[PDB]
Amino acid sequence: LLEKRPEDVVIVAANRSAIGKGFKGAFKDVNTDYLLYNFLNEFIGRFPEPLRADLNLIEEVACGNVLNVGAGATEHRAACLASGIPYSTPFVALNRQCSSGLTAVNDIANKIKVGQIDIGLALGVESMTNNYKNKNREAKKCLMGITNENRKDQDEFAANSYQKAYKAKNEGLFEDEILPIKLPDGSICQSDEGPRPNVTAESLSQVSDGVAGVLLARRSVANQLNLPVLGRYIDFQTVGVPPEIMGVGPAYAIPKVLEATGLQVQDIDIFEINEAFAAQALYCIHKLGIDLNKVNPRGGAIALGHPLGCTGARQVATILRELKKDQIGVVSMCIGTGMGAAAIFIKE
Amino acid sequence: LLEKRPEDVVIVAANRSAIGKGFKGAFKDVNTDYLLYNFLNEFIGRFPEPLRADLNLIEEVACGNVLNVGAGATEHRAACLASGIPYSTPFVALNRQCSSGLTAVNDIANKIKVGQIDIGLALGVESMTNNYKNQKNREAKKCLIPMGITNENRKDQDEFAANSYQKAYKAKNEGLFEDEILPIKLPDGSICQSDEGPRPQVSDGVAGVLLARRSVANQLNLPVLGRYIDFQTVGVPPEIMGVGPAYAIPKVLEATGLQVQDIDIFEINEAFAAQALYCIHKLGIDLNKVNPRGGAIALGHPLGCTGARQVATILRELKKDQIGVVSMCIGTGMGAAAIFIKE
């Protein structure tokens, strides 16, 4: 599995923006279209010379999105079009709820794999700020908090993430993966404005906005073009989970991707398990038996925020900077109307 | 290619609904969730014993949609939930615009090829009637050119148009569109199951396609209407979005080795007569092969349903071992095309 074959799906670049605060945040006066346009312009400069030389080398743009009309396909495609990605490049809008951005990844993973394409861009956007704006059993469930309701450990959990996120923030740890998004006033945003110092434990995830991109390619095509390689996508698995207890997703998706690859929990160095809510994150980690030490190393959703769409691909950018050469890490998250997703990766 | 390996992505079922008329037709007092719930209750019935038994063997439901909030991901999951498809079955909402129903098929194909799943359901749904109610740079503004205008970018069109209605009613009347169309029951008691438009187009309709690996089909004793060969997409100038089929057909043929003259039926979506004519001409296609039972000019084009519809239609127009393609130009400047084989 650690053997690099020429038919591997390889990650060439994985970047994300600073996650702003919903409603209050840096992004409030901006929508997914400006966020996307801008992140793209940044992401492209960060691209190896043969690519930016011929952008029509990207043969597909899957963009995950949960709240726009039709998942933002017209605006997101216009945005790509403004950031130099040629018309010659098809675009696909996807919405698998909370995992959307991780599914943009599985979409391109498979196309490349199957030969449909060689090089392909996975995206994730969400402007919860400007978009949150839009009964007979079973179907009566479907689309969060109450499925969670279905506290000491949870606050304990909320603070440690908040502490891990603050350390990491302050230690410069996210300075690699984050890109500066210029705001229309003149400002520029390169810090996650969600993690805060001194969070301890007190009685009383986050509505945010953000973009995140991933550039996959098949190893063969990479070597030929001599393109840097950060790690490689190994597999992906989704599962259906009772909608009333959505959060339970990770406790079923993880074992699934594990069995399908042959790995075991204890073969994983890092787990990027999305914390929609602390109650559910904790439950997932403890049912599986995951080492809490190995969970969300630099802070989670609780502290960082959760821009629905963008999250699944944000965790990828992130898990890559937390990993060390030849390490395996999973990316999982509970999904909205009752699902569970989880992709596996390796550094190199 | 006409060799059959168990590794094949095989169509086990593929039915559609009657395409209602926009703003006035049969479905006007209903939305996607109802069209879906119903289409599915029907489709599932027209499902082989084994699947109906389990229904959990279906491991993914990708479902195109173009105009709903978030392409109808929640509403339609519930519909599937309500029509007996288990929670266990994940779901994905896709929006490739005009080709959404086809790319939803592309989706299912790939997952099956890449071993991700065995059997999967592809869908298309749209209710232009209900949902049709949902930058300043020289490049992305082309993603603001109204479709019709891009068509601006007559006799021959009207002649091409005429045939569409002619072939469609001739065929509707001869009962050609019967095996494919399922009966969508309506609130006011009136069952609907006949195409309004063809009576010698904005519309609402649903469509479903149940792929499975060949090896798997033979294992569960399942019927096999045909096979998915390839699919290909290619961007195109948004100002002439229509020219999309002219490029995606060569590309998918090329990807397969096939040639134009190797194709029997050419189900090229008629989004406009001006457009479809061009692809036809540029490609050098025998009209007797293009849209045999008429097109969308008569039948209507329920945006995200179409792709999944054309597959239903084509699979009847094709005889055992015939190859045919399904192309359509795509909204913001694209073009798709797939290739199927009967058996």
Curated annotation (Swiss-Prot), chain A:
One annotated GO biological process: phenylacetate catabolic process
Family: Belongs to the thiolase-like superfamily. Thiolase family.
Reaction(s) catalysed (UniProt annotation): an acyl-CoA + acetyl-CoA = a 3-oxoacyl-CoA + CoA
UniProt-annotated location(s): Peroxisome; Mitochondrion intermembrane space
NCBIfam families to which the protein is assigned, alphabetical: AcCoA-C-Actrans
Active site per database record: 98, 306, 334
Keywords, in A-Z order: Acyltransferase, Fatty acid metabolism, Lipid metabolism, Mitochondrion, Peroxisome, Transferase, Transit peptide
Domain of life: Eukaryota
Swiss-Prot/TrEMBL domain comment: The PTS2-type peroxisomal targeting signal, which mediates interaction with PEX7 and localization to peroxisomes, is cleaved following import into peroxisomes.
Quaternary structure annotation from Swiss-Prot or TrEMBL: Homodimer. Interacts (via PTS2-type peroxisomal targeting signal region) with PEX7; leading to its translocation into peroxisomes.
Name used for this protein in its record: 3-ketoacyl-CoA thiolase, peroxisomal
Involved pathway(s): Lipid metabolism; fatty acid metabolism
Lineage, uppermost ranks: Eukaryota, Fungi, Dikarya, Ascomycota, Saccharomycotina
